[PDB]
Amino acid sequence: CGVGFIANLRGKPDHTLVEQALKALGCMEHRGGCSADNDSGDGAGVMTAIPRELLAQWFNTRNLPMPDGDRLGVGMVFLPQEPSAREVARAYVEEVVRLEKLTVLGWREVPVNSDVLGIQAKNNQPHIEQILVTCPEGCAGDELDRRLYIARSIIGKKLAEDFYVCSFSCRTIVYKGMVRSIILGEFYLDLKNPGYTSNFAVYHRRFSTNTMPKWPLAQPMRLLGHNGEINTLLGNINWMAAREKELEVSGWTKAELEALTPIVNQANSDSYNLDSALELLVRTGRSPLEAAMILVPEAYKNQPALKDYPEISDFHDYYSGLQEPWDGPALLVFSDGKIVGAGLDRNGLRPARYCITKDDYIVLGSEAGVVDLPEVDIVEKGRLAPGQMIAVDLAEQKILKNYQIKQQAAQKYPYGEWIKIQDAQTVLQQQAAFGYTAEDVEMVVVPMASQGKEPTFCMGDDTPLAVLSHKPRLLYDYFKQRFAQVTNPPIDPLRENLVMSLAMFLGKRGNLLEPKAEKLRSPLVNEVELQAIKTGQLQVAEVSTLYDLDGVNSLEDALTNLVKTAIATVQAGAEILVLTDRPNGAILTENQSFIPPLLAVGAVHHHLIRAGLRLKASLIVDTAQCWSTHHFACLVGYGASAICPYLALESVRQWWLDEKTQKLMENGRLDRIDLPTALKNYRQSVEAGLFKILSKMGISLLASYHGAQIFEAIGLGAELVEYAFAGTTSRVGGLTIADVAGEVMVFHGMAFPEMAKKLENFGFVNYRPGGEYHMNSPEMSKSLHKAVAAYYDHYELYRQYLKDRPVTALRDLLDFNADQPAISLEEVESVESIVKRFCTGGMSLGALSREAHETLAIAMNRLGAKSNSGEGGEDVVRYLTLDDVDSEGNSPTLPHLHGLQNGDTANSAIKQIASGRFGVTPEYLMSGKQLEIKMAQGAKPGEGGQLPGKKVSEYIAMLRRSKPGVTLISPPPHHDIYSIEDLAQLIYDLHQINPEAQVSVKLVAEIGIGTIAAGVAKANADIIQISGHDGGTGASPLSSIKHAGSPWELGVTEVHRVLMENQLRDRVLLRADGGLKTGWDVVMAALMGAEEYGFGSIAMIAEGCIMARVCHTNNCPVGVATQQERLRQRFKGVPGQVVNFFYFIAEEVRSLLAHLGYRSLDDIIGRTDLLKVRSDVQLSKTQNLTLDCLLNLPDTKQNRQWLNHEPVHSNGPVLDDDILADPDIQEAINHQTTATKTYRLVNTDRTVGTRLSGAIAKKYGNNGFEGNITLNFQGAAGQSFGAFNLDGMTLHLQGEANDYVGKGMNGGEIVIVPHPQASFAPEDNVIIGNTCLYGATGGNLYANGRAGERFAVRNSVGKAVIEGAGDHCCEYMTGGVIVVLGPVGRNVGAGMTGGLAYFLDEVGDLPEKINPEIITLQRITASKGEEQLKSLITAHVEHTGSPKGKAILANWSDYLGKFWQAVPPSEKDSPEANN
Ligand SMILES: Cc1cc2nc3c(=O)[nH]c(=O)nc-3n(C[C@H](O)[C@H](O)[C@H](O)COP(=O)(O)O)c2cc1C
Ligand code: F3S
């Protein structure tokens, strides 16, 4: 989406504003989307004041007296086209308008020209009429909208695609619909009528993830246009929905409030819902500015900028207990008629640039150079930093964030005023019966307790799904975590922790509406906290989560009465219910079992809701059965306001308190551990885990996580889900209440009747002869390897292991149902032809040894398939095919490989672009036939790459241009992609730099990937890849291997279907990967939708992985996942070996095509009707599972056109295309040429320079060119200006640019300068946006002004001079020099690990802002640092004239005093931070 507003304070209404607003919609076109058509828009809209002039002619013609501004009031209605029905609908608007004591003066048909609509939109166009109304009583402004508010909500109860009120106010009106941005005025002709004038305009361009536009959904709503995604929707809705019967306000009637009956609704969009909510707040007596503050609170904790504003710290301090944030990215632009303003979500995940004139004319929007003011007369150019608002008020004043927020600081105050005022070893078998296992405590609780970090581990979740395994499992194991993908970003929980909180409010929430003067640091509560609170505000009935046998026969009953107990107790005034499995202190064999803490808090939390009661109490789960990081999150997830993990906590006591342990602590295990530390660590480790899981979905506050239900259940049947966990997706639908009962019986059996010695071990984490199955295991994989090494008896073996396999994945429930005769193997397409569909999967050169990695690439290339460079860059040297191979099978060019033919090439066909952009370099991008944007990997969806430091050798450091010692945790988001349009910006960046290369986007299965993919398809991707929760890593958290992600059978299926229904399926080829290792696997993914197939772990095995599962360790015994030379030298493994493995897999495929009866894999894809559910299988835990979700897909028998994709998607005609057209291909092919060119840039010119840079790079690579092209530019520059810029490529921007300047900058220079015609302070004025120098690898950028957030985010080696910046300066920085000549936001440190930064922060306050976790703040001491500073501070002035540059240069000796140098330890001892 594109949003913005325009306001005129110092004029009376004109048409030009409207003209300007329309224009700007136009300049937002790329931030929006189209439909099957490529013609109809995902929607465009504009909010203005009532064009009271234009409506003139209406009254005139009817000889009717026009009412006062304040007393007219206008509905824009959408009505059915069919005449009888239009009148049914008209008579109703009027009927209900009549029902408040208002009169109708009639109706204006709205002149429109349907002829410009695209076909889908036209087909679908409601009939549009404005109704004019008045109050005979003499109602006006506040009372009249307030009335019209009640009114549109009533009309809303009958809302349809055909029948919808856009707006109904005496102050504001909305013209919107399903048009492409510039068409908006062609359609509605009023907007081109000069009689249309407004003091403002809120405009919005929509981007939808579908193809099928519905007019009410276009969007400025009644109050706000909203660009972003609510990422805690289901929560926020659920809480509001519970406020709804108990709404109480200032005189507002219990009948009028009941009239907004349901003000919030699951079915509607995050925007409809937000607008609606925002409305309630406003109409009930707050100003849109304040309502937005309540609902999308700033991040106030730790904010240097709040020093002298303690009022507002108390505003959110207060509201924080009442209203949890509507989280996710968001630029909110809204109007009242009375006020127009904009404000950002807390993290500021959407750009907002604004401009002010001498006349206090203001323009805000997602992009800079958009409305075309006269530069000579601009007075500010700024931007909203995270949380900030800016408004305008009818009484002629602009209103910057500080007033603003104080203005609701000032009133209702009590703020800080009222806030102030507010033994044996039974342990061994409790453990056994609450379902702990040897691995749970040894491998999970213990590490948390000893090291204070949940455990790392490696490779992927090898084992069957809770519901399909035969081993007992927890109810928790059935919930997989959901995470953010293209549609919103994860946030960085370590580097950006300062924005989160695990606070949790214990009292009942009051009236949100009525600010009356009338808390838990973390969700985790220790025996102390527990009792403290059983003192507290109120008494707190325990409810026996427990229940005795026979009598109360069933868990069903116990559930029932729990709920009833719970309901009754809350009625009886109970304000907290501690749901204990430890009721009165004990847990017996005859206290025969429990209610699982999860199934309990769920039931209470929904049944309370169903009861009207949830706002009344808040809930503590007091449980043995919770210890896991995931466990807590499932609890806070389905309702727990907090958790006392009593028996977990105990297992730290029993562990520490034990000879074995104390002994090893006396020598061995770090005995830096009094029990107070084990304990403080156990929990501190749970906190890091809740942070992590939240950020996987980009959520800041546990407060938001809490309602929401950020999981996807897999294996729970419908009634169970409805009953306990209402509105969670469970598409496979398994378990019953009894079904779950039986399972808790399985581990109740074994602590009581049985013998309590040591808890059993099911090799869940790690292959064991006794225990849970594993698709891969060391013995199985040694025989596979020996098979391939030959060219037989092993596959009998290997194939055997494969047989004794139980049910594991969902594909295992399914068999085939050929619809044709079997066929001759000789008919079937060749092995060589299947192999082209195979892919080896982008495993990081870091993670694997180069022997292992280069091998896969040679082998993949041989097969005419492709291999993939994961996220660690590729060594240039591979880019060349090999001559040097000799008789022996070695090559001087790669002396460490073996068995190389003279035809070989180790260059990766796919080159990855991942969050850290480690090797991401112009030649890099040009070296690949395809480009992969890695949104997530299967082992760890909401998270970044990890590579522990052990593994970062000098080689790797050189490749990634990061520092040798140092661990690399890449950022969870691409700082580059905060929304789908953002995705579309990067796809376009890449199409731009190397037009020839198909761009894939790699997504992980989860409910919702379908919709996301529709977007990815609209965003111009060439390939989508679905990756199951299944797949491998060489380092991830154990929790995430085990608890984040969904089966790729759901991933592939859902994408394939949604893409088909949207008619986008042809736009994209699908890859799947996730524990595929078998011809059958391949065939099943083809039936399911996939056209290409990816192999990580088996390709590894085939080269000699055993399955040590020690990948994070750097010990692979086998030379595969280590950097250690010693170990690498042990790498047996030859391209031939994997070449063979894939032929095996192909041959295996051919024969399936034969049983089946088709010649070619091309014939089978998505032929889902060929699948049936298996006769054999029955599981231990449920009768069966519904598989509608994999069986029911678009019939593919005859429509197979979708299987034809264009060869590569185009960015279309681009300014570079021309740059590269004139006497320029001489300055290139004649290697040393000076060229100059100047052009005017408008902000649809995006990624300018980039293509020329690819073009140079494709022939000279990164540094072969000693020419010099100077490109000078004029105007406002769109996204990604001067991306991937190269040496002797100089870029002049006269004006301003937007986000991503110098993204991936490699070399050369980029100078950006105001237009001289300015009478403003460059220093004090924004000239560049967020995320500049993103993965900068070289180059120098110079910028006369302030810059956005994340400046130089993962800067590896680029240098820059700018004059001010937002937050997160230097975020993940790793090298280079960054010089900033003006103030800066907070987190100035985060993860910066190498390179130098110098600031100059005269307010003296810098060190308050700086991220203290790693960097250090020096004053300049080493003369060589001054020399470094000067040289840039000078070159800046040489490149610009920078008034601020010149000032400091002639006062070199003054300002130079305190003015900080940021040193990462790692730079401590260089010539420029010592001596
Ligand atoms: C050792 C190792 C390293 C990996 N590195 C990356 C990575 O760099 N980027 C990425 O997207 N996926 C990475 N993955 C995952 C693969 O790209 C692929 O999605 C996955 O291995 C498929 O799972 P599978 O092993 O079950 O076949 C890695 C997996 C492993 C085995
Ligand atoms: S599991 Fe990993 S540590 Fe080794 S044998 Fe395989 S590469």
DSSP for 1412-1444, written as a single string: TTS-EEEEP-SHHHHHHHHHHHHHHHHHS--HH
Burial class (CB in 10 A: 0-12, 13-18, 19+), 1319: exposed
At 15, list the tokens. Answer: 């048409």
Phi, psi of 1027 (to 5 degrees): -135, 130
Do residues 1050 and 1153 share a domain?
Answer: yes
1212, 1237, 1257 — which closes off a domain?
A: 1212
Q: 765, 787, 814 — which closes off a domain?
A: 765
Q: Are residues 621 and 730 in the same domain?
A: yes
Distance (Å, whole) CA 1141 – CA 1149: 13
Q: Which residues pair with 1362 in a beta bridge?
A: 1343, 1380
Query: What is the count of structural domains for the chain?
Result: 4
Ligand 1 in reach of 1097 Cβ (< 6 A)? yes
Q: Does 211 lie in the same domain as 235?
A: yes
- Ligand 2: residue of 779, 785, 1109, 1115 to mutate (most ligand atoms within 8 A of CB) is 1109
Q: Is 356 found in the same domain as 438?
A: no
| Count of helices and strands (H, E) across the chain | 47, 45
| Biggest distance spanned by C-alpha atoms of the chain | 102
> To which H or E segment does residue 285 belong?
none
DSSP string covering 837-893, please?
A: GEE-----TTTS-HHHHHHHHHHHHHTT-B-B-TTS---GGGGS------TTS--TT
For residues 1185 and 733, the answer to whether their CB atoms sit within 8 Å is yes
Q: Assess whether 1109 and 1245 both reside in one domain.
A: no
459 and 470 assigned to the same domain: no
DSSP string over 624-642: SS--SHHHHHHHHHTT-SE
| DSSP-based three-state secondary structure for 54 | coil
Which of 1259, 1265, 1299 shows the shortest CA–CA distance to 1283?
A: 1299
Q: With left for phi above 0 and alpha for psi between -120 and 50, is residue 1008 left, alpha or beta?
A: left
CATH number of the domain where residue 153 is located: 3.60.20.10
Catalytic residue among 1, 34, 634, 1332: 1
Q: Is residue 389 a contact partner of residue 404, using CB atoms and an 8 Å limit?
A: yes
Can you tell me which atom of ligand 2 is nearest the CA of 1111? 3
Nearest residue (by CA) to ligand 1, atom 30, is 1033
Contacts of 930 (CB under 8 A, 6+ apart): 866, 909, 910, 911, 997, 998, 999, 1000, 1022, 1023
- The verdict on 1225 and 1327 lying in the same domain is yes
Q: Which two tokens stand for residue 227?
A: 């660009």
- Report how far residue 638's alpha carbon sits from residue 640's, in angstroms, rounded to the nearest whole number: 6
Q: How far is the CA of 1142 from the centre of ligand 2 (A)?
A: 20
CA distance 1365 to 1326: 8
For residues 1192 and 1172, what is the distance between their CA atoms, to the nearest angstrom?
11
Residue of 937, 943, 947, 1115 with the most ligand 1 atoms within 8 Å of its CB, for mutation? 937
CB 927 within 8 A of CB 874: yes
Q: Which of 388, 382, 398, 392 is nearest to 330 (CA)?
A: 388
Q: Alpha-carbon distance 1214 to 1241, whole Å?
A: 11
1339 close to 1301: Cβ distance less than 8 angstroms? no
Report helix, strand or coil for 342: strand
* DSSP, residue by residue, 489-533: ----TTTTGGG-B--B--SPP--SSS-----BSSSB--HHHHHHH
1172 shares its domain with 1239? no
Q: How remote is the CA of residue 1027 from the centroid of ligand 1, in Å?
A: 9
Ligand 1 center–CA 644 separation, angstroms: 37
Residues within a 6 A CB radius of ligand 2: 458-459, 1100, 1105-1111, 1116, 1118, 1120-1121
* Token pair in block for residue 127: 């009939």
Asked if 1096 and 845 touch (Cβ cutoff 8 Å), the reply is no
Q: Contact 1153/828 with Cβ under 8 angstroms?
A: yes
Q: Which atom of ligand 2 is nearest to the CA of 852?
A: 7
Token digits of residue 1434: 């000078």
Does residue 1034's CB lie within 6 angstroms of at least one atom of ligand 1? yes
Residue in the structure block whose two tokens are 């060749």:
830
Among 517, 535, 560, where does a domain finish?
Answer: 517
- Name the phi and psi angles at 587, rounded to 5: -130, 95
1121 C-beta closer than 6 A to ligand 1: yes
Please state, in angstroms and rounded to a whole number, the distance separating the CA atoms of residues 837 and 829.
12
| Helix segments in 1374-1422, DSSP class H | 1406-1409
Beta sheet of 1023-1027, edge-to-edge order = 838-839, 1092-1094, 1069-1073, 1023-1027, 998-1004, 930-934, 910-913
Structure tokens at 1133: 């493994």
Question: Hey, what are 855's tokens?
Answer: 């091998």
| Cα 232 to Cα 420: distance, rounded to the nearest angstrom | 30
Tell whether residue 1111 is among the known ligand binding residues: yes
Residue nearest to atom 2 of ligand 2 (CA): 1111
58 and 170 co-located in one domain: yes
| Dihedral pair phi/psi, residue 1427, rounded to 5° | -50, -40
Give the 3-state secondary structure of residue 1213: coil
Q: Is 135 annotated as a binding residue?
A: no
Tokens of 1371: 């975020």
Q: Please check whether residue 1210 is in contact with residue 991, taking contact to mean a CB–CB distance below 8 angstroms.
A: yes
CATH code for position 1062: 3.20.20.70
Residue 1318 sits in the same domain as residue 1426: yes
Q: Which residue has the least CA distance to atom 7 on ligand 2? A: 1121
Residue 1105, annotated as binding a ligand: yes
Tell me if residue 1 is catalytic.
Answer: yes
Contact 1194, 1057 (CB under 8 A): yes
Q: Pairing state of beta strands 618-622 and 642-644? A: parallel
Map tokens 């005022």 to a residue.
421
Give the chain's end-to-end CA distance (angstroms, integer).
52
In this structure, are 448 and 368 located in the same domain? no
1057 alpha carbon, distance to own chain's centre? 23
Q: Which atom of ligand 2 is nearest to the CA of 1108?
A: 5
Task: Quote the CA–CA distance of 67 and 55 in Å, as a whole number.
Answer: 11
Q: CA gyration radius for the chain?
A: 32
Distance of CA 1358 to the CA centre of its chain: 27
Based on the domain organization, do 1206 and 1217 belong to the same domain? no
Q: Find tokens 């000789």 and name the residue.
A: 826
Task: Specify whether the CB–CB gap between 1000 and 914 falls below 8 A.
Answer: no
The amino acid present at 1033, given as its one-letter code, is T
| Strand 1289-1297 with 1268-1277, pairing | parallel
The ligand whose atoms approach the alpha carbon of 847 most closely is 1
| CA pair distance 487, 478, nearest whole angstrom | 25
The parent domain of residue 336 ranges over: 1-421+509-517
Q: Which residue from 723, 725, 721, 722 is spatially nearest to 710, judged by alpha carbons?
A: 725
What CATH number is given to the structural domain containing 1252?
2.160.20.60
Deposited experimental method: X-ray
226 phi/psi in degrees, rounded to 5:
-140, 120
Kindly report the protein residue whose alpha carbon is nearest to atom 29 of ligand 1. 1033
The finding on whether 944 has its CB within 6 A of some atom of ligand 1 is no
**Is the CB of residue 1232 less than 8 Å from the CB of residue 1267?**
yes
Handedness of CA 576, 582, 583, 584 (dihedral sign): negative
DSSP secondary structure code for residue 780 in this structure: H
